[PDB]
C-alpha cells in the first residue's frame, strides 16, 4: 500500500515553491496533519497580552501552556481515573465501549475537541473552496470549541445507554 | 501610497504625526504577533492581511490591528527625499520590530 | 434542474432566449407546478372529510360521489399548467380559460358533500371540527377569488399584484395549516395516549383565525389599485401606506398565535389527561379507533369483521346496523 | 516488470512546453504502481493460503 | 415573513437592502412550499394509512427511512445558503427563464438551491 | 385485481384524448404552429399510465381471487404467513449522507468532492443490499 | 473608421447608464466615475465578465461575457475618449497581442511572482482568501492580455502595479512564469489540488487509512 | 356605489379598459352572491342543528340523494359556461390590432430603466406625417431618432396625443420585464426575443379620452432594482404633441421640449428613489 500510494499520489514538491527568504510568503502555510491542532489552537486564541512594569507577556504563551497541560495529561490519565473511581484490581478482560459510558463520553469529547482544532489550521483552504466568510470561519471555530464537546458528551452518554438497552 | 480622495481618515499615532512624506507611509512588513510577512495589501478598504494566522491591521489608522490574535501595532518608518528626488529614511524605528518578547516589544 | 445545472457549469446553451429557451423553462416548470399545489391540496381534503362525520354523528354524504371528485380533479389537474402565462401573449387562452372553468366544478360537489353530512346532525363543537369550519369558510373565499382570476382579461389586470398573493394564500393557508391542526387535534391520542387541553386549543383557533383574516383581506385592494408583488420599497406619495401597516399588525397577531400550540403540545405530551381506552372522540370510524389508543407494534391484536366503510361504528354500535342499513337512501 | 522498467525507461527531466515529455511525467507511477502490486500480489497469495490450507 | 412585513410598513428602507428582501421572500416561498407541505403530506400518510387499511406494516420499510433521510439532508443543503458571504438565492420563487443564468445571478446560492 | 386496471385505463383514456386535443389544437390557431413542449409531456404521460394500467391488466388475467378483492369473506381466509419486512436498520442514513454528499459536491463545482460521493454511494447501496445475506464468518 | 464611437456611445447607454450616468459620473449609489479609467480597464472588467454587474457586493465574481463581435473594442474607445488611462497593447495587425506578451526568462519571472503576487494568490496561482467575503481567484483560465490588464488596472482590492514599478519587460515575464505554471505537469503523480497538506492528510485518512483497516478486518478475525 | 363593488379598480381611460371595468364588476356580484348563499347554508347548519340537545338517541343515517346531486352537479356548469362565453367575446375585442396605427412607440425596457422610440407619426388628418425609423442598427432591437432614455436621477417620460390610435412595441435587452400602466387595465410581459419564443410583443389603444399624468410600473423580477423602474406617461392634445415633437427634432433634451409648452418638465406622480 505505501509503495502505490508512493508511486501515485505526490507530496511535498519542494521546486514549486522556491528557497526560503525572509521577505516572501505564500498563502496556504499549513503544517503537517499532526501539527495542525496546534496551529489552529494558536489561530483561534483570543489576543490577550499583559504588560506590566517593564515588561510584556505576549499572546503564545497562552498556547504554549496549553499544549503543555495536554502534553502532561495524557500520560497522567490512569492514575486520575483509578483515583476518582477508585478500583484498584488486576484485570485482564477487555470492557466493550458501550458497557462504560462516563470514559466514552469522555472520549468522544476529547476527539470532538481535536477535530475542531484541527479544521480551525485550514480556514484559508475552507473558506476558499466552499464559499464562507474568513471572519466567519474564526468565529465559528472559536465558538465550537467551547460548545461542541458538551453536546458531543450528551449524544455519546445516551447513545451509549441505547446500545446497552 | 494613499489616493489622495481619502487623506483626511488618516489618525496619525501619538509619536509618529511627521513620518509620512505626502501620500507615503512606510510600514514594516514583519507582523508584530509572530514575524511573518504581513504582505497582504488590499488596495481600497487599506487592510493589510497576514497569511499565516489571519491577522489584520488598518493602514489609515496607524496600522492597527482589527483581527485576530495580533495586539500591537506595526512600526512606521520615517521618510523624506533627497537634494537628488530618491527616497531615503528619516532616522529610525521609534520601538524594536518583530515580535514581542520579556523584556519590552 | 438538471438542464438548468448543465447551463450554469458548463455553458449549455439550453435556456438562451434565441433558441425557445424563455418560454421552454416556462411550459416544464408549470407543467410541475400546478399538479404540485393539488398535491398539496387533496389529502386535506380527506382529513376534513374524515373529521366530519365523527363530530356531526352521520355517515359521510356521497361516498362514491367524493370518490369520483377526487378522480375528476386528478385527471384535470395536469392539462390547465398554463393558465400561469396569460401575460406573456404566447399560450392558446381559450382552451386553458375553459378548462380551469371546467376543474371549479369537483371542488363545487365536493363542498355540497361536505355541507351535505353537516345537514341535520348532533353537532359539537370541538377543536378538529372548530378548525374544519374555518378551512371550510377561508377555502370557499379563496376558491372565489381564484375563479374570479381564471378569466384572462381579468388577470391582464390583476397578475403579478397582490390581489394573487391574496388569493393563493387563502387557498393555502385555509387548507394545510386548518387542516393539519385539525388532524393533530384530532389524532393526537391516537399516536400518543394523552389528551390536549381544549381551552388552550380554542384561545388558539381564535387567535389565528383573527390574526390570519386582518392580515390578508386587505390585500385585494391594496393590489387592485396599483402595487405589484416582490416589490421591497415604494413612496409617500402613492397611496396603501395604511393598509400596509394593517397587514403588518396582522401578521404580527398571527406570530404571537403560535405559543399557545407549542405550550399545548409541550405540556400535553407528558402530563395531560390520559386515554385508557379506543376511540376518545365516540362514533368514530375506519378502522384506527379499534385498537389501542398507543397501538402496539404491528398495530393490531385482532380485527373486526368488516361490511361498510364503517366497521368501528357497527363494532361498538353492533344495534345500529339495521338502522343504518334501511334508511341509508332517503336523502 | 518493475526491473525492466527501472531499467530500460527514460527517466530523465525533460519539461519544456515545445517537446511535450509526457514520458517522463509517467517515470515514477511506474515505479510505484509495478513495486506495490508486486508485493501486494505476494501478500494476497500468503493470505489466502492461510486461509484455506 | 415577518423580517418582509416589518420591512414592508413604513415606506422608506429602514434595515434591509433590495438583495436580503429578494433573498428573504425567495427561501420563504421555497422553504414554506417544498420543506413544510409535500413532507407534512407524507407525514399524516405514515401515521395513519397502514392502521386504516389494516395492515402491520408499509410496504417497503426501509425506502420509509430512506426518504424522511433524504428529505432532512436536501432541506439543510438547500438552507445553507444563508452562510454563504453573497446570500441565499435571490430570483423568484418560480426561476424565471433568463434570471437565473450564470450571467445574472451569478452567486453560489443558486447552486445549493437546485440541488 | 380488477379496479386498479380500471382505474389506470380511465387515466390513460382521458391523457390521450387531452394530448390529441392539444396537439391539433395548437398545430392551427396558434403563433409558431405545434407547441413541442406540452405536447411531449402529456404523450408521455399517456404513456406512464398506460404502462402501468397494462401491467395491472396481465396480472389480473392471470390471477384467481384474492380476498381483498372478495366480498362475502372472512377473516379466516386470509390466515397465514405473510412477506418478510424489515426490522432495525441504518443504512438508509449513511446513503442519504453519501448523497447529500455528492450534491453539495455537485453545487460547488468540486470534483474531487463528487467522485467521493459516488464512492460512498456505491459502498452504502451495497452494504445495504447484501444486509440479510451475509453468512456467518468463516475463521 | 476609428472616427465611429457612435456605437460604444449605443450600447453604454441601454447597459450601464443605470449605475455609471450618462455622462460616465458615478452614480454616487453605485458605481465610480470611470473617466480617469481607460481601454484597458474596459477590456479586462468585459472581457473577463465581471461586468455588467448584477446588486454587487464584497467581489462581483466572473461570470460569462455579454459583449464580443468588435464591441468590447467599441466601449473601450467610447470610454478612453472621455480620459487618459491606459490601453490595450496591440500587434501589427490591430488585434490584441497575445503571443508578444510572454516573455523569456522564467527565474526572473517566478522570483517577481513571489515577491508580489504569491502573497494573495498561491505558490502557482491557485486561489487565495481574503477578509470578510473577498478572495483572490485562480490564475489558470486567464489569458495574456486579460493577466497583463490585470497587474496594470488594479482590480477591486487588488493593488494597482504602474509601468513605472514593473516594467514591461517584468510583466512579461511574470505573464510567461504564470501561464507555464498553469500548464506543466506534475511529475510525481496526481496532485492533490495544488495546496499544501491539508489534501495529503485527506487523502491519507481516506484512502491508506482504509485500506489498512479493511485488510485487517479481512485478515484477523471478529468477535 | 360602483367604486366599492370594484375592489378598487381603477376607472378606465380607453375604451377596452371600461369593457373590462364592466365585466370584473358583473363578476364579482356573481361570486359575492354565491358565497353569501353558501355562508348562510353554513351558519345555519351550525347555528340550529348544533343543538345536541337534552334528548338524543341518534339522528339519522342517511347518505344518498341522487336528484339533488345531479342538480347541484348541473348546475354550476351553466354557470360557468355564461361567463366563458362573455370573457371569449371581451378578450377578443381587447386585441384588436388594427393594421393602420397613427403613433408607434418603441419600448424597450434593459436593466432597470426603459427608453422609448417614437418609431412613426401618421396622422389620418394628413395633418403631420413623420418616419424615425434608422439603420443605425449596424439585432431584434430597435434604434430611432428621438429617443428618451430614462436614468436613475430622471425619471423618463413618455409623451402622447390624446384621441389617436397607439401602438405599441416591446423589446427587452437581458431579461423579462413587465409594462403595466394601472390605468390601462391592461399589462404585457417585455420578453428578450419574442419572434424566437413564439409570443406577439404588439398591442393597440384605440384612444385615450382623458388628459394628464399616469405611473407605469415593472411587474416581473428584474432583480436587485425592481421596485425603481418606474416611468410616466404624458397625454397631451395633439397641436401640443406636434410642438413638442417638432421642437424635439431640433437637439433638445426632454425636459426643455416639455417646459417649452408651459408643462411641468419634470415627472408630477413619481419621484426618483433616493434609497438606490
Ligand atoms: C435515480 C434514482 C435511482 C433510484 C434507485 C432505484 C429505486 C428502486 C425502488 C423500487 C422498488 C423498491 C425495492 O425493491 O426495495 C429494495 C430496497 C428496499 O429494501 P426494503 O425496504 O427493506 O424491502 C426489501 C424488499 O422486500 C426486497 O428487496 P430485495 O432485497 O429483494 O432487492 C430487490 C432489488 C431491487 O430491485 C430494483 O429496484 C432494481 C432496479 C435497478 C437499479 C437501477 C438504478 C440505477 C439508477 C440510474 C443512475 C442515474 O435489489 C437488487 O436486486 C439489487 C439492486 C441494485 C441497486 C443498484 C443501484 C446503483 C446506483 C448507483 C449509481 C452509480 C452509477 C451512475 C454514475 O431498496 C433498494 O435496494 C434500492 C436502492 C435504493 C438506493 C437509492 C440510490 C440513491
Ligand atoms: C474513496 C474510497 C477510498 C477507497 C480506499 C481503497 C479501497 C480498498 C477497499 C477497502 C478495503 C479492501 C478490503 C480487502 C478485502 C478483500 C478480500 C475479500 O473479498 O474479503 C471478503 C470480505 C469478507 O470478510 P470476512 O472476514 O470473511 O467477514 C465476512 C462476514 O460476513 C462479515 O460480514 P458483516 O456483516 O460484518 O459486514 C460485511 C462488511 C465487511 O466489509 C468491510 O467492512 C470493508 C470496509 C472496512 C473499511 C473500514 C471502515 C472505516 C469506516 C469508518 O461489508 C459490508 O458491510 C458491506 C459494504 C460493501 C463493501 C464492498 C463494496 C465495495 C465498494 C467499491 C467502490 O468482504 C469484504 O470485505 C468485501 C469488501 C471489499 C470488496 C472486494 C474488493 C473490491 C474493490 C473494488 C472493486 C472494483
Ligand atoms: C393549495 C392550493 C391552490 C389551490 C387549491 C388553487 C386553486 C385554484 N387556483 Fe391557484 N394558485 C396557487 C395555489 C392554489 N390555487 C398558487 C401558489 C399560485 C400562484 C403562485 C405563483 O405564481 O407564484 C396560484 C395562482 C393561480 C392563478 C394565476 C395567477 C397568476 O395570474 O399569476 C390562477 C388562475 O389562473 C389560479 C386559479 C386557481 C383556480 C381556478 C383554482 C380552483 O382550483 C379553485 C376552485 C375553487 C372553488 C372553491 C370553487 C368553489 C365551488 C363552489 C362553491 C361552486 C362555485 C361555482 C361557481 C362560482 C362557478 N391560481
Ligand atoms: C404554504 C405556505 C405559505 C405560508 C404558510 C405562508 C405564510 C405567510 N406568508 Fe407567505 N408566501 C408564500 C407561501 C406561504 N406563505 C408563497 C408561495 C409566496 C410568494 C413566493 C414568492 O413570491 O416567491 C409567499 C409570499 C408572501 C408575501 C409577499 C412576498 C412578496 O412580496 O411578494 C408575504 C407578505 O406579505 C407573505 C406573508 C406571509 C405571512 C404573513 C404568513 C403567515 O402565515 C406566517 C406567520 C408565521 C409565523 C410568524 C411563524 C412564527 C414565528 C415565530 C414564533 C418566530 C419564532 C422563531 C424561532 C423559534 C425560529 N408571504
Ligand atoms: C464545513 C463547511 C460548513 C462546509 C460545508 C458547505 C456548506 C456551504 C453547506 C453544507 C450543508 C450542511 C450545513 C448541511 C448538511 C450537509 C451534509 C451533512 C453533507 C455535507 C458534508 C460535507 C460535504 C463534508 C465536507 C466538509 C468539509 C469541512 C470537509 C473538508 C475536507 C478537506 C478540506 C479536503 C481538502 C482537499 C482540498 C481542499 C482539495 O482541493 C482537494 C483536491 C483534490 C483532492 C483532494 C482534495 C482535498 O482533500
Ligand atoms: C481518545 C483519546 C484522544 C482520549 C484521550 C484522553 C484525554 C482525557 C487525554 C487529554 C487530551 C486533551 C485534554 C485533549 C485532546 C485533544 C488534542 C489536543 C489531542 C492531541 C493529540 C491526540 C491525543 C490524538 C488523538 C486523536 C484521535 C484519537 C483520532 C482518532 C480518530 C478515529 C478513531 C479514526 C477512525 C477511522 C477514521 C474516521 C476513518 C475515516 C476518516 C476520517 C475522515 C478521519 C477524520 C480526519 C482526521 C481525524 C484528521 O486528523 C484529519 C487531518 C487533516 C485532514 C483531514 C482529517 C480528517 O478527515
Ligand atoms: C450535469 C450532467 C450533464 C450531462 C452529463 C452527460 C455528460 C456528457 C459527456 C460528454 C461531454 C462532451 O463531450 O463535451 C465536451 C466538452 C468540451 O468543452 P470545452 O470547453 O471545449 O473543453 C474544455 C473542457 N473543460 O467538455 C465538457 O464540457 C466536460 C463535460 C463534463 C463531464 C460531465 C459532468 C458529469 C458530472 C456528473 C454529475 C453528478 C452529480 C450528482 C449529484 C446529485
Ligand atoms: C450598477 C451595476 C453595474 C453595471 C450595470 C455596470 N457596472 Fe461597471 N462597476 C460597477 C461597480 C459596483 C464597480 C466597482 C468595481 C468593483 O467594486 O468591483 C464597477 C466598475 C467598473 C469598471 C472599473 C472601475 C475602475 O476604477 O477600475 C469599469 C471599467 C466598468 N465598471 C465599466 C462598466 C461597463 C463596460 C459596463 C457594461 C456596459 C458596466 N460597467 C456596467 C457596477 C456596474
Ligand atoms: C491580495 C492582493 C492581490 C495581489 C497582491 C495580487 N492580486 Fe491579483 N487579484 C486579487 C483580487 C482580489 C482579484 C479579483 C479582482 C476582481 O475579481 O475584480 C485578482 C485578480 C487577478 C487576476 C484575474 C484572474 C481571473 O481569472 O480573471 C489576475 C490575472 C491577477 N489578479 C494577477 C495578479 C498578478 C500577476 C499579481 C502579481 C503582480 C497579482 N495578481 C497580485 C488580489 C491580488
Ligand atoms: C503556532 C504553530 C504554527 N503556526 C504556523 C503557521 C504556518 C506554518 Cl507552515 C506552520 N505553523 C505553525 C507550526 O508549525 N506548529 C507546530 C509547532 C508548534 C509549536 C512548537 N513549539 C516548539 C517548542 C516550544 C517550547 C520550547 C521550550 C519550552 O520550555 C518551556 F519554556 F520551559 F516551557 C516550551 C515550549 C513550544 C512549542 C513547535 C512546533
Ligand atoms: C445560528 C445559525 C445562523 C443561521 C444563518 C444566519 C444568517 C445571518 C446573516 C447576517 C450576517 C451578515 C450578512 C452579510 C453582511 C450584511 O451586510
Ligand atoms: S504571524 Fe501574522 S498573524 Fe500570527
Ligand atoms: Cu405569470
Ligand atoms: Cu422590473
Given at each position: 500500500?505505501?509503495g ?7 507530496i511535498?514538491?519542494?521546486?514549486n ?8 510568503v ?25 504588560y506590566?512594569?517593564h ?47 462516563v ?12 477535530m ?26 472559536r ?23 | 501610497?494613499?489616493?489622495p ?29 509572530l ?32 483581527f ?24 529610525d ?13 | 434542474?438538471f ?18 429557451g ?9 407543467f ?11 389529502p ?6 374524515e ?10 354524504f356521497?361516498?362514491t ?13 395536469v ?28 371542488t ?6 361536505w355541507?351535505?353530512?353537516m ?6 363543537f370541538?377543536?378538529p ?9 377561508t ?5 372565489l ?6 378569466s ?10 397582490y ?8 387557498v393555502?393557508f ?32 381564535w ?8 392580515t ?5 385592494w ?5 402595487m ?16 400596509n401597516?394593517?397587514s ?7 406570530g ?15 402530563y395531560?389527561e ?29 380485527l ?23 334508511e341509508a337512501?332517503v336523502? | 516488470?518493475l ?13 519544456a512546453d515545445?517537446?511535450?515529455d ?7 507511477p ?24 | 415573513?415577518?423580517?418582509?412585513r ?31 407541505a409535500?413532507?407534512?403530506?407524507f ?30 439532508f ?8 444563508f452562510?454563504?458571504?453573497g ?16 450571467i ?12 | 385485481?380488477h ?11 382521458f ?6 386535443v ?10 409558431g ?17 398506460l ?8 396480472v ?5 381471487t ?32 453519501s ?9 460547488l463545482?468540486?470534483p ?10 456505491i ?5 445495504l ?11 | ?12 447607454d ?6 455609471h ?19 484597458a ?6 472581457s473577463?465578465?465581471?461586468m ?10 466572473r ?37 508578444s ?10 522570483d ?18 481574503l477578509?470578510?467575503?473577498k478572495?483572490a481567484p ?27 514599478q514593473?516594467?514591461?519587460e517584468?510583466?512579461?515575464?511574470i ?11 506534475q ?12 489534501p495529503?492528510?485527506?487523502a ?20 | 356605489?360602483?367604486?366599492?363593488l370594484?375592489?378598487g379598480?381603477?376607472?378606465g ?41 337534552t ?18 352537479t348541473?348546475?354550476?356548469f ?13 378578450q ?11 403613433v ?32 443605425e ?41 413587465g ?28 384612444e ?10 415593472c ?30 427634432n431640433?437637439g ?17 406622480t413619481?419621484?426618483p428613489?433616493?434609497?438606490?
Open positions: 500500500v505505501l502505490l500510494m508512493g508511486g501515485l499520489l505526490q511535498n514538491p519542494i521546486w515553491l522556491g528557497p526560503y527568504k525572509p521577505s516572501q505564500s498563502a496556504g502555510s499549513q503544517p503537517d496533519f499532526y501539527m495542525m491542532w496546534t496551529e489552529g489552537l494558536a489561530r483561534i486564541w483570543p489576543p490577550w497580552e499583559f506590566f512594569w515588561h510584556t507577556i505576549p499572546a503564545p504563551v497562552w498556547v504554549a501552556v496549553i499544549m503543555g497541560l495536554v502534553f502532561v495529561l495524557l500520560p497522567a490519565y490512569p492514575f486520575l481515573e483509578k483515583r476518582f473511581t477508585g478500583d484498584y484490581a488486576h484485570h485482564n478482560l477487555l470492557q466493550r465501549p458501550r458497557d462504560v459510558p470514559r466514552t463520553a469522555i472520549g468522544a469529547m476529547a476527539i470532538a475537541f481535536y475542531v482544532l484541527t479544521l480551525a489550521a485550514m480556514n484559508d483552504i475552507i473558506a476558499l473552496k466552499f464559499h464562507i466568510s474568513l471572519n466567519a470561519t474564526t468565529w465559528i471555530g465558538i465550537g470549541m467551547v460548545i461542541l464537546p458538551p453536546f458531543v458528551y450528551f449524544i455519546t452518554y445516551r447513545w451509549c445507554i441505547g446500545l446497552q438497552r | 501610497r494613499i489616493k480622495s481619502d487623506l483626511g481618515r488618516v489618525v496619525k499615532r501619538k509619536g509618529q504625526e511627521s513620518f509620512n512624506f505626502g501620500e507615503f507611509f512606510a510600514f514594516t512588513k514583519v507582523c508584530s504577533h514575524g511573518c510577512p504581513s504582505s497582504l495589501y488590499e488596495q481600497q478598504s487599506y487592510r493589510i492581511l497576514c497569511p499565516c494566522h489571519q491577522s489584520q491591521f488598518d493602514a489609515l489608522h496607524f496600522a492597527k490591528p482589527i485576530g490574535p495580533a495586539a500591537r501595532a506595526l512600526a512606521q518608518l520615517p521618510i523624506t527625499i533627497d537634494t537628488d528626488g530618491y527616497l531615503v529614511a528619516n532616522g524605528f521609534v520601538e524594536p520590530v518583530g515580535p514581542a518578547f520579556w523584556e519590552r516589544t | 434542474l438542464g438548468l445545472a448543465a447551463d450554469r457549469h458548463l455553458g449549455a446553451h439550453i435556456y438562451d432566449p434565441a433558441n425557445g424563455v418560454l421552454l423553462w416556462q411550459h416544464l416548470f408549470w410541475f407546478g400546478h399538479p404540485e399545489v393539488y398535491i398539496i391540496a387533496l386535506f381534503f380527506g382529513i376534513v372529510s373529521i366530519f362525520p365523527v363530530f356531526s354523528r352521520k355517515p359521510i356521497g361516498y360521489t367524493l370518490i369520483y371528485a377526487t378522480l375528476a380533479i386528478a385527471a384535470l389537474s392539462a390547465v399548467w398554463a393558465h400561469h402565462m396569460y401575460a406573456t401573449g404566447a399560450v392558446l387562452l381559450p382552451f386553458f380559460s375553459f378548462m380551469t372553468f371546467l376543474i371549479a366544478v369537483p363545487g360537489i365536493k363542498f355540497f358533500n355541507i351535505g353530512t345537514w341535520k346532525g348532533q353537532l359539537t370541538e377543536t371540527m372548530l378548525f374544519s369550519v374555518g378551512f371550510l369558510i377555502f370557499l373565499l379563496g376558491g377569488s381564484g375563479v374570479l382570476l381564471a384572462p382579461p381579468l388577470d391582464f389586470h390583476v397578475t403579478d399584484s390581489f394573487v398573493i391574496a388569493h393563493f394564500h387563502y393555502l385555509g387548507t394545510i395549516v386548518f387542516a393539519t391542526y385539525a388532524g393533530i387535534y384530532f389524532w393526537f391520542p391516537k399516536m400518543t395516549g394523552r389528551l390536549l387541553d381544549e381551552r388552550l386549543g380554542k384561545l388558539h383557533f387567535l389565528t383565525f383573527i390574526g390570519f383574516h386582518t390578508f383581506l386587505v390585500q385585494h391594496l393590489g387592485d389599485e396599483g405589484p408583488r416582490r416589490y421591497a420599497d415604494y413612496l409617500p406619495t402613492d397611496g396603501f401606506t395604511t393598509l401597516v394593517i403588518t399588525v396582522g401578521a404580527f397577531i398571527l404571537v398565535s403560535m405559543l399557545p400550540f407549542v405550550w399545548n403540545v409541550f405540556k400535553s405530551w407528558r395531560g390520559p386515554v385508557t381506552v379506543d376511540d376518545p372522540w365516540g362514533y368514530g370510524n375506519s378502522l384506527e379507533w379499534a385498537t389501542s389508543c398507543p397501538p402496539p407494534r404491528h398495530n393490531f391484536t385482532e373486526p369483521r368488516i361490511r361498510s366503510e364503517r366497521p368501528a361504528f357497527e363494532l361498538h354500535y353492533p344495534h345500529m346496523v339495521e338502522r343504518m342499513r334501511a337512501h336523502g | 516488470a526491473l525492466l522498467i527501472f531499467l530500460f525507461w527514460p527517466w530523465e527531466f525533460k519539461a515545445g517537446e511535450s509526457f514520458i517522463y511525467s509517467l517515470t515514477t511506474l515505479y510505484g504502481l509495478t513495486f506495490g502490486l508486486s508485493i501486494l500480489s505476494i501478500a494476497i497469495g500468503a493470505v489466502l493460503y492461510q486461509k484455506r490450507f | 415573513a415577518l423580517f418582509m416589518t420591512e414592508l410598513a413604513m415606506p422608506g428602507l429602514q434595515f434591509l437592502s433590495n438583495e436580503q428582501f429578494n433573498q428573504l421572500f425567495t427561501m420563504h416561498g421555497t422553504v414554506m412550499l417544498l420543506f413544510y409535500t413532507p407534512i403530506v407525514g399524516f400518510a405514515n401515521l395513519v394509512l397502514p392502521l386504516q387499511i389494516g395492515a402491520p406494516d408499509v410496504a417497503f420499510p426501509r425506502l420509509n427511512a430512506l426518504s424522511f433521510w433524504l428529505f432532512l436536501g432541506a439543510l443543503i438547500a438552507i445553507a445558503g452562510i454563504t458571504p446570500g441565499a438565492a435571490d430570483f423568484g420563487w418560480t426561476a424565471y427563464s433568463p434570471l437565473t443564468d450564470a445574472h445571478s451569478p452567486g453560489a446560492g443558486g447552486d445549493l438551491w437546485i440541488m | 385485481m379496479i386498479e386496471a380500471r382505474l389506470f385505463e380511465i387515466l390513460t383514456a391523457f390521450a384524448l387531452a394530448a390529441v392539444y396537439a391539433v389544437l395548437t398545430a392551427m390557431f396558434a403563433t404552429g405545434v407547441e413541442w413542449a406540452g405536447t411531449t409531456a402529456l404523450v408521455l404521460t399517456t404513456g406512464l399510465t404502462i402501468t394500467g397494462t401491467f395491472f391488466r396481465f389480473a388475467r392471470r390471477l384467481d384474492r380476498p381483498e378483492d372478495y366480498e362475502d369473506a372472512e377473516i379466516s381466509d386470509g390466515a397465514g404467513e405473510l412477506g418478510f419486512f424489515a426490522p432495525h436498520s441504518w443504512w438508509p442514513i449513511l446513503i442519504s449522507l448523497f447529500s454528499t455528492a450534491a453539495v459536491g455537485a453545487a463545482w468540486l474531487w468532492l463528487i467522485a467521493a460521493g459516488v464512492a460512498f454511494v459502498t452504502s447501496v451495497c452494504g443490499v447484501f444486509e440479510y445475506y451475509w453468512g456467518p464468518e468463516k475463521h | 473608421s476609428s472616427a465611429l464611437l457612435r456605437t460604444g456611445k449605443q450600447l453604454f441601454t447597459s450601464c447608464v443605470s449605475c450616468g450618462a455622462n460616465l459620473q458615478g452614480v454616487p449609489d453605485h458605481g465610480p466615475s470611470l473617466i480617469g479609467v481607460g481601454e480597464a474596459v477590456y479586462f472588467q468585459v473577463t465578465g465581471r455588467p454587474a448584477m446588486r454587487g457586493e464584497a467581489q462581483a465574481p461570470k460569462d461575457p455579454i459583449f464580443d463581435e468588435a464591441q468590447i473594442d467599441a466601449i473601450g474607445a467610447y470610454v478612453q475618449a472621455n480620459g487618459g488611462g491606459p490601453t490595450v497593447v496591440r500587434n501589427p495587425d490591430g488585434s490584441i497581442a497575445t503571443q506578451l510572454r516573455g523569456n526568462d522564467l527565474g526572473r519571472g517566478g517577481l511572482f513571489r515577491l508580489n503576487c504569491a502573497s494573495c494568490h498561491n505558490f502557482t496561482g491557485k486561489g487565495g482568501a477578509s470578510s467575503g478572495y485562480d490564475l489558470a483560465p486567464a489569458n495574456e492580455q486579460q493577466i497583463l490588464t490585470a497587474m496594470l488596472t488594479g482590480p477591486q482590492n487588488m493593488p494597482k502595479f504602474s509601468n513605472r514593473l516594467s514591461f517584468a510583466k512579461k515575464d505573464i510567461a512564469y504564470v501561464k507555464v505554471a498553469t500548464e506543466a505537469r511529475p510525481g503523480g496526481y496532485l492533490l489540488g495544488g495546496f499544501g497538506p491539508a495529503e492528510g485527506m491519507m485518512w481516506i484512502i491508506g487509512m482504509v485500506a489498512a483497516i479493511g485488510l485487517a478486518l479481512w485478515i484477523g478475525a471478529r468477535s | 356605489w360602483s367604486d366599492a370594484a375592489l379598480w381603477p376607472t381611460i380607453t375604451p377596452e379598459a371600461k369593457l373590462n371595468r364592466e365585466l370584473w364588476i358583473g363578476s364579482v356580484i356573481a361570486s359575492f352572491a354565491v358565497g353569501a348563499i353558501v355562508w348562510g347554508l353554513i351558519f345555519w347548519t351550525s347555528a340550529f342543528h348544533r343543538k345536541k340537545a334528548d338524543t338517541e341518534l339522528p339519522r343515517q342517511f347518505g344518498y340523494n341522487m336528484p339533488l346531486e345531479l342538480t347541484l348541473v348546475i354550476p351553466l354557470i360557468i359556461s355564461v361567463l366563458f362565453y362573455f370573457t371569449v367575446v371581451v377578443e375585442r381587447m386585441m384588436h390590432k388594427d393594421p393602420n396605427p397613427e408607434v412607440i418603441d419600448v424597450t425596457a434593459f436593466q432597470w430603466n426603459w427608453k422609448f422610440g417614437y418609431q412613426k407619426i401618421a396622422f389620418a388628418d394628413g395633418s403631420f406625417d413623420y418616419d424615425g425609423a434608422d439603420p442598427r449596424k439585432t431584434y432591437l430597435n434604434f430611432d431618432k428621438i429617443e428618451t432614455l430614462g436614468t436613475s436621477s430622471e425619471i423618463p417620460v413618455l409623451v402622447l396625443p390624446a384621441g389617436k390610435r397607439i401602438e405599441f412595441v416591446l423589446n427587452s435587452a437581458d431579461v423579462i420585464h409594462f403595466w400602466v394601472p390605468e390601462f387595465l391592461f399589462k404585457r410581459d417585455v420578453l428578450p426575443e419574442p419572434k424566437a419564443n413564439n409570443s406577439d410583443n404588439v398591442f393597440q389603444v384605440s385615450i379620452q382623458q388628459t394628464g399624468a399616469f405611473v407605469g410600473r411587474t416581473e423580477m428584474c432583480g436587485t432594482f425592481h421596485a425603481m423602474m418606474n416611468f410616466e406617461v404624458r397625454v397631451v392634445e395633439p397641436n401640443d404633441f406636434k410642438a413638442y415633437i417638432d421642437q424635439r431640433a433638445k433634451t426632454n425636459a426643455e421640449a416639455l417646459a417649452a409648452i408651459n408643462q411641468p418638465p419634470l415627472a408630477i413619481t419621484e428613489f433616493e434609497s438606490r
